[PDB]
Design a binder for this molecule. Structure first.
Ligand SMILES: *C(=O)[C@H](CCCCC(=N)N)[C@H]1c2cc(-c3ccc(O)cc3)ccc2C[C@@H]1O
Lengths: 36, 10, 259
């Protein structure tokens, strides 16, 4: 629960949790058929 | 090269 | 990491450093997948051609780090290993197939701003995201130029480095090498003609290739840094362990013991 404990995995305290983006993560999302 | 770590970890 | 850049603080809070006790040195990268489990490449521990065979007491895990060499006094945590589990069919004799290992920590880490686990993919996440041309991200403290065949320049980072790399089509992966490629591997890297470059390198093995899901905005670990021929050589690629295809074994070991 959820897996081992989390549940909260993959959400970074300093970024996703505060709705801040890191400086190159757009490069990743733009490659995922950009999206829209 | 490494800074020394605290002896409780050895 | 070759041709990447300095990570932001807290950009990769699942990154783990595998550190030996004596002589004190960086062995490999790794990743934090819950409060007491670490994921790495089996070849970081066990590699008979080179007389490598680490046990639990040979090693420390360091979590929460940014600087490579500093003891990050109220930031990093150091942990001890209770138990190492290598995949029973890791093929070190031939091609590093099933290059994966789990490590159980002696006591759980507390999470913080700098320490947070990554998610592991489910089938539909693997299926959507693991596609040629999609980019993932590799992080590590390993060499900055190929001393994995004696290159110089800058050498070794002071801080964690990061690079984003596209996944490559399987045919082109297999036509770059003489090594037999399995379904438990994928490759990644830029093609010679693309103009961007970058790669993992020595000291990076074992750490995470991660991607961010566009559907739920979480980070998932899709690969483990496993092997490559050289670092950032044209027409060569990095190969990674396929984490989803080995997920049954991961769930097995973390279920059977197992509290
Ligand atoms: C880990 O740091 C290195 C290599 C990581 C960087 C990979 C890359 N350039 N994309 C590790 C390594 C590599 C091999 C290997 C096996 C089989 C080949 O055909 C080529 C290379 C073996 C052993 C190691 C140890 C080291 O940890």
């Amino acid at each position: 629960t959820f897996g081992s404990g989390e549940a909260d995995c993959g959400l970074r305290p300093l970024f996703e949790k505060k709705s801040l983006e890191d400086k190159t993560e757009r490069e990743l999302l733009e490659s995922y058929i950009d999206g829209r | 090269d490494f800074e020394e770590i605290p002896e409780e970890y050895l | 990491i070759v041709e990447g850049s300095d990570a932001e603080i807290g950009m990769s809070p699942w990154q783990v450093m595998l550190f030996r006790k004596s002589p004190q040195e960086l062995l490999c990268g790794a990743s934090l997948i819950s409060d007491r489990w670490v994921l790495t490449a089996a070849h970081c521990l066990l590699y008979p051609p080179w007389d490598k065979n680490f046990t639990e007491n040979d090693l420390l895990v360091r979590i929460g780090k940014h600087s490579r060499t500093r003891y990050e006094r109220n930031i990093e945590k150091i942990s001890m290993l209770e138990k190492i589990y290598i995949h029973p069919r890791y093929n070190w004799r031939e091609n590093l197939d099933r290059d994966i290992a789990l490590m159980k920590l002696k006591k759980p880490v507390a999470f913080s701003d700098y320490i947070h686990p990554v998610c592991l993919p489910d089938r539909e996440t693997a299926a959507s995201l693991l596609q040629a041309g999609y980019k993932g991200r590799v992080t590590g403290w390993g060499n900055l130029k190929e001393t994995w065949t004696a290159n110089v320049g800058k050498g070794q980072p002071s801080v964690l480095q990061v690079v984003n790399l596209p996944i490559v089509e399987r045919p082109v992966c297999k036509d770059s090498t003489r090594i037999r490629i399995t379904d438990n591997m994928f490759c990644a890297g830029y093609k010679p003609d693309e103009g961007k470059r970058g790669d993992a390198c020595e000291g990076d093995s074992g750490g995470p290739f991660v991607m961010k899901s566009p559907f739920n905005n979480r980070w998932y670990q899709m690969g483990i840094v496993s092997w490559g021929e050289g670092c950032d050589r044209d027409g060569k690629y990095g190969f990674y362990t396929h984490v989803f295809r080995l997920k049954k074994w991961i769930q097995k070991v973390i279920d059977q013991f197992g509290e």
